[PDB]
Structures are given as structure tokens and as C-alpha cells.
Design a binder for this molecule. Structure first.
Ligand SMILES: CC(=O)N[C@@H]1[C@@H](O)[C@H](O)[C@@H](CO)S[C@@H]1OP(=O)(O)OP(=O)(O)OC[C@H]1O[C@@H](n2ccc(=O)[nH]c2=O)[C@H](O)[C@@H]1O
Length: 681
């Protein structure tokens, strides 16, 4: 009998200890309750969710099942089990638990919201939006549901009630911070919403504390460090993105370009081999390659790092998918650094330095960051473009440089069998520009090939491949030949109403102008048309193309006249892609790091004239460029020149800069010095 009443005392006592934040005590008391009365549903469930908090996901799962066995109609256990299964990468099982909770109780708001998260994670946004809507009809005061729904509406550019939604988001966060709860907005989404910098940093810090808490359970002693060095710094780059991922498209040449007499490089991969060349290249080029995806336990993973005797541990993930920040919370290296992958602060006590530059992160804005700033000599950004897209080093015009374009790794066959020549043109300053022009006055078979959807054609015995030796033409993407094409190739979530208003503003003032965007995702296309229409411009003047493979994408950009950056959150990589083809990008920097990346890139490129200071200047710079043919020609030439002359795409300069920064970090450590802001130059 009760007995079951004794089990009640302990369960509630464990509950009390859990409210106060004594997680170990609670666990022990829930265990004691189950030793006393094993068939106790509520206690299995409570123990499971405490076990889930501590990162013991496998054990939690065992006790949720015991709860559900004893009480089959325990909808709440099904729901939390679904979350544990989610965290364990088992999207399939999570889906069934949430389904089951809804079958038990169709009015269970959380289960609808949890389900919606699955849909959102899998890129199924319309379905996620229904489920979040459902959750909010059943429970209107549901911060988690509301903030995730808000994020889905960003992804799809649904801006209905935008201004009140943004304020409601800000209310919920500030409220949550004051009540000392973990907020409903993810630190990585932070940069989209009008939160104060202090707010964004607090969200970040709370995620960092989560990492410390999860890790406190291991009861490890702090690592003890080597204090003096006599030759080589051991640097460890830790990332889940070594493979086919934008991060490797930026940095893959860097490990192999490091001066091996100064530093020994270790690349720690957090994800499995995906068999791609990018993973192979980083594997070969890097002096040391370790795969930590084979070491699931964060405790052991930290140990391996400590055992490799690493001085500087570099976080390339921050709060992004695949991160294992618990490793950094264990402090397996005396100095720990954020670099490249996450455009924001960690807010973590266990991160010392962030790698940036003076444009991206001016000292005036240092309070944004928990980390001490460390300045690269020029921009903190890089790209492997010089190595990945050598065929895009220059273009060959066929017959204006952006209507029909040929690119090749080897131009021999074409130059040997057609009239290709390097004309000069003078443009009013007074500048001389060189073009390579292939003239064959037979547009027919080139247009005919595109018109019929042909894979290939042959100009005078030479095989030319349809870009959809390669040919790219405005027809391929439905762009008018005489149009002035403004482009942006970012995920649509980066666009807000103020951005779009400015773009319609420039389109209204530029005679034959068109806006080129991407179905990223497809379902956003409609919303953008509707709003454009509402702003007083024909929807037909905004042309959308499909998300393309990396090569086609960078190659397409050659057809744009001018690229327009998104001031809400700049296009970090795509803007590199576009610059590589010498297409100017006009930007307006804000205050967050993610707002200022393009400015940093352009500053390094030596083109500050493309960096606006107000919305008015942004629009005016873009209007002048679509309106003054000669000025546009001169600036595209300057951008083209700068792309090979400047450090922006120079991967070896970049390695040197990292080295100086790492040396400086060590010097401070070798002396008794606390981290403080440093610079390379
Ligand atoms: C705001 C933010 O979080 N930024 C992060 C940065 O701060 C980090 O520095 C980046 C590397 O760590 S990741 C991330 O950078 P982002 O620019 O947001 O890249 P994102 O993940 O949207 O995809 C663009 C890719 O799709 C390719 N792309 C694009 C269009 C197309 O048609 N085809 C195509 O292959 C493009 O060539 C690109 O390769």
C-alpha cells in the first residue's frame, strides 16, 4: 500500500529541490522514490526530465518509457520523450511521440508546437506555420510557439503586423530575462530583431551557462596548463563544417597555407566524413586531422584536445547546428577564440577572443561582445574563390559586358578558332578599361541553343556548354537584355520591409531596372510580389531564379549590373561570391557584426564609395549607378582590378594575419596578462 505515500513525500521533496536548482539532490531523491515504489509514473517522468537537463539523454529516454508503460495516457511524457529523441538526432522517433501526444490529447498545445519544430528543422515551413498557429489558438500565451512562428514568417517574408510582432518579440525577451528564464529567441536569430545589444548578449550568456551546467555534471577538475613555450604554437580549429558547407568554401586553403615553422595546425572535425573533396583537402593539407565525431562524449573530446597540448582552441561554430560548445566550457586549452562561423558574440566566460577587424567591430561597439576584440590586418572574411573558381578570373564578352558571357579554364580552342580580342575603351576622371571580346556575328546558334534547351552548341568546331567552355546569358534567367539588373542572392529571411521599400524606391527611379532574387525558399516569392505590388511597382519587375549549384551561382552573378546588400543582416558569403566576379555591391552597415560584414569586405577592396551612411545615401548610390553608365563602367573596372590586387581573396596574407594574432595571444598569456584587445598590424 502507501508506502506509495512515502514515495509521494520524496517525489515532492525532489520537486522542491529541483525548483531551487539542486539538480543532483533531485535526481537522488527521485531515485529514492523509485526504490520505494517502482510503479510510480510521475517520478519516472520527473527523473527523466532532470536527466535530460544534465545531458544524460540515453537515461532520460529509459525513464520516459517506464512512465509511459505504467501510464499509457501520459501525453506529457510522450511530448518530452519526443524532445529527447529530437536532441539525439532521431527525427523519426520524435515525430511519433509528438503524434502520440496529439492522439491522446488533440488540444495539447505543446505537442503541436513541438511537431512544428520538426517541420521547421526539416525546411518544411508551410507545415510548421500551421502547427505553430494551431498551438497558439489552443494556448495564446505561448512564448516558445510565438517566437518560432515569428522566425518562420521571416523565412517566408510574411510581414503582416511586422511592427507589432517585432515589439511583441522584444517584450517577451525582456520579460523572460527579468524572470531569470532562458529566452524563447535563439542567439543566432537575435540579429534580426530590434533588441538592444545588452539583450542580445544576455541571451548569448544564458546559452553559455547552459553549457556550463550540462558540463558541471561530469565533475571534472580544471585543466592545468603549460605556461612557457620555447617553438611552435599548437592551434586547433574545431568545426562541424569540414565538408560541403559554406565554411569550407571560405577557409579550406588556410590550414595548408600556415607557416609550419611557426604553428602546428590541428583540424578537429565534429561531423562525419561526407566523402567530398573539401573534407579531403582539409584532411591532407592540415598537419593534424582528428575526427571528434567518433568521440561522442564531450568529456573525452576535451581530454583529447588537452592531450594534443593545444594552446589556442578556435570555435568555428558558435550557436549553430552541430556545435559542441560543452567542449569549450570544459576549457581544454588556455586560450579560446571565436572565428569565422558565427557572426555574433558567445557571451561566454570561457571565450577570450573574437577574430574581426576595425570596420566590422569598431571599438566604439565593443560592449556588444563578451570577448575581447582581435583585429586582423584587413577584413576577417575570406574565400577560396581564387582556387575554386579560376575559370571566373575573367569573362569573355560575346556579340556591354553582362548580357552574354563565356568562361573557360582553357581558352586555347576558342582563341585558335574564332576572333577573340582584347579591346580598349575609354570612359569619362578618364579611365581606360580592357575587355576580352569574342565576335562571331552569329548570335543565332548561341540563342538557338538556349531557346530550345540544348546542352551544347559549337562555334566553329569548338564545343560550348549551356550554363544551365561555358556560356552564360540573360535569357537563361529571364532577364531583359537592356535591363539594369540589381541583384541579391541571399536567403530571403535577410529582407525586412524597410529593405524592400528602399529597393522599390530605387526601382521607381531607375528607368529600365529590374530586381533579381532567388526562390530561397520558393514560398517567399508570392509574399515579395504582393508587397512589391502594394508599394506601387509591377511585380514582373522582380525576377526570381532557382537556387543553383555553387558553380552556376557564382557564374550567374556576372549578369548583374549592381548587387544590393541587405542591411538587416548582410550576405556574408554570397557577397564574396558576387565581388569575385567584379560586380559592385552597395551596402549600409548597422551596429551588429552581421550588419557590417559587407562594409568590411568593401573597405578591404578599397571601395568605400559603395558604403552608405543612411537609407537615403544607400538609395542614391544605387540610383546613380543605374543612371550614370560611365560611372558604373568605371566602378566595375575598379572592383575587378581590386579583386586581384587587394588582400580580400589572398589566402596567404590571411594565414599570416592569423599567425600574428595567435602569437600576440600567446605573448599575453606567457606574461601574467589577462586577455585584452589586440591587433595584428
Ligand atoms: C548570417 C550568418 O549566419 N551568416 C553565416 C556566416 O557568418 C558564416 O561566415 C558562414 C560560414 O561559416 S555561414 C553563413 O553565411 P551565409 O552567407 O549566411 O551563408 P548561407 O548559409 O546563407 O548560404 C549561402 C551559401 O549558399 C550558396 N548558394 C547560394 C545561392 C545559390 O543559388 N546557390 C548556392 O550554392 C552560396 O554560394 C553560399 O555558399
Amino acid at each position: 500500500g502507501p508506502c506509495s505515500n512515502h514515495a509521494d513525500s520524496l517525489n515532492n521533496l525532489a520537486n522542491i529541490k529541483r525548483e531551487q536548482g539542486y539538480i543532483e539532490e533531485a535526481t537522488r531523491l527521485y531515485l529514492k522514490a523509485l526504490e520505494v515504489f517502482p510503479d510510480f509514473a510521475a517520478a519516472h517522468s520527473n527523473l527523466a526530465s532532470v536527466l535530460q537537463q544534465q545531458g544524460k539523454l540515453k537515461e532520460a529516454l529509459m525513464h520516459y518509457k517506464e512512465a509511459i508503460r505504467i501510464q499509457p495516457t501520459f501525453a506529457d511524457a510522450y511530448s518530452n520523450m519526443g524532445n529527447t529523441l529530437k536532441e539525439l538526432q532521431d527525427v523519426s522517433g520524435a515525430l511519433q511521440c509528438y503524434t502520440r501526444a496529439i492522439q491522446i490529447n488533440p488540444a495539447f498545445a505543446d505537442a503541436h508546437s513541438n511537431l512544428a519544430s520538426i517541420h521547421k528543422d526539416s525546411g518544411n515551413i508551410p507545415e510548421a506555420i500551421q502547427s505553430y498557429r494551431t498551438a497558439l489558438k489552443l494556448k495564446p500565451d505561448f512564448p516558445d510557439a510565438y517566437c518560432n512562428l515569428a522566425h518562420c514568417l521571416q523565412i517566408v517574408c510574411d510581414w503582416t503586423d511586422y511592427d507589432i510582432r517585432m515589439k511583441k518579440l522584444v517584450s517577451i525577451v525582456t520579460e523572460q530575462l527579468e524572470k531569470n528564464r532562458l529566452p524563447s529567441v535563439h542567439p543566432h536569430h537575435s540579429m534580426l530583431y530590434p533588441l538592444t545589444h545588452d539583450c542580445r548578449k544576455a541571451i548569448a550568456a544564458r546559452h553559455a551557462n547552459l553549457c556550463l551546467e550540462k558540463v558541471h555534471v561530469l565533475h571534472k577538475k580544471p585543466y592545468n596548463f603549460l605556461k612557457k613555450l620555447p617553438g611552435r604554437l599548437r592551434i586547433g580549429y574545431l568545426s562541424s563544417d569540414f565538408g560541403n558547407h559554406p565554411t569550407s568554401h571560405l577557409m579550406q586553403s588556410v590550414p595548408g597555407l600556415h607557416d609550419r615553422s611557426k604553428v602546428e595546425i590541428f583540424c578537429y572535425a565534429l561531423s562525419p566524413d561526407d566523402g567530398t573533396t573539401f573534407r579531403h583537402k582539409i584532411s591532407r593539407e592540415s598537419e593534424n586531422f582528428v575526427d571528434l565525431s567518433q568521440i561522442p562524449c564531450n568529456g573525452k573530446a576535451a581530454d583529447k584536445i588537452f592531450n594534443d597540448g593545444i594552446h589556442i582552441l578556435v570555435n568555428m561554430n558558435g550557436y549553430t547546428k552541430g556545435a559542441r560548445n560543452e567542449i569549450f566550457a570544459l576549457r581544454p586549452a588556455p586560450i579560446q577564440v571565436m572565428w569565422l562561423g558565427y557572426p555574433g558574440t558567445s557571451g561566454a566566460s570561457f571565450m577570450d577572443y573574437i577574430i574581426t577587424d576595425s570596420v566590422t567591430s569598431p571599438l566604439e561597439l565593443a560592449y556588444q561582445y563578451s570577448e575581447k576584440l582581435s583585429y586582423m590586418p584587413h577584413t576577417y572574411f575570406i574565400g577560396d574563390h581564387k582556387q575554386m573558381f579560376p575559370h571566373l578570373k575573367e569573362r569573355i564578352i560575346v556579340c556591354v559586358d553582362n548580357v552574354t558571357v563565356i568562361n573557360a579554364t582553357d581558352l586555347s580552342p576558342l582563341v585558335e578558332n574564332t576572333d577573340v580580342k582584347e579591346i580598349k575603351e575609354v570612359v569619362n576622371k578618364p579611365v581606360e578599361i580592357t575587355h576580352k571580346v569574342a565576335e562571331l556575328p552569329n548570335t543565332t546558334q548561341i540563342v538557338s541553343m538556349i531557346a530550345t534547351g540544348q546542352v551544347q552548341t559549337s562555334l566553329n568546331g569548338v564545343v560550348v556548354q549551356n550554363g544551365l567552355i561555358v556560356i552564360t546569358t540573360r535569357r537563361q534567367y529571364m532577364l531583359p537584355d537592356d535591363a539594369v539588373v540589381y541583384c541579391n542572392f541571399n536567403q530571403l529571411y535577410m529582407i525586412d520591409p524597410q529593405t524592400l521599400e528602399s529597393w522599390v524606391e530605387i526601382l521607381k527611379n531607375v528607368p529600365k531596372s529590374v530586381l533579381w532574387l532567388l526562390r530561397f525558399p520558393a514560398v517567399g516569392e508570392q509574399n515579395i510580389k504582393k508587397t512589391v505590388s502594394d508599394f506601387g511597382i509591377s511585380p514582373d519587375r522582380v525576377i526570381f531564379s532557382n537556387v543553383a549549384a555553387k558553380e552556376e551561382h557564382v557564374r550567374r552573378g556576372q549578369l548583374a549590373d549592381i548587387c544590393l546588400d541587405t542591411p538587416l543582416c548582410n550576405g556574408h558569403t554570397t557577397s564574396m561570391d558576387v565581388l569575385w566576379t567584379g560586380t559592385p555591391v552597395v551596402t549600409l552597415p548597422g551596429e551588429t557584426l552581421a550588419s557590417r560584414v559587407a562594409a568590411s569586405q568593401l573597405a578591404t577592396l578599397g571601395c568605400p564609395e559603395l558604403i552608405a551612411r543612411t537609407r537615403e545615401e544607400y538609395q542614391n548610390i544605387a540610383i546613380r549607378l543605374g543612371t550614370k553608365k560611365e560611372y558604373l563602367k568605371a566602378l566595375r573596372a575598379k572592383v575587378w582590378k581590386a579583386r586581384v590586387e587587394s588582400p580580400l581573396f589572398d589566402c596567404s596574407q590571411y594565414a599570416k594575419g592569423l599567425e600574428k594574432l595567435f602569437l600576440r595571444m600567446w605573448e599575453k598569456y606567457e606574461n601574467g596578462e589577462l586577455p585584452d584587445h589586440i591587433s595584428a598590424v
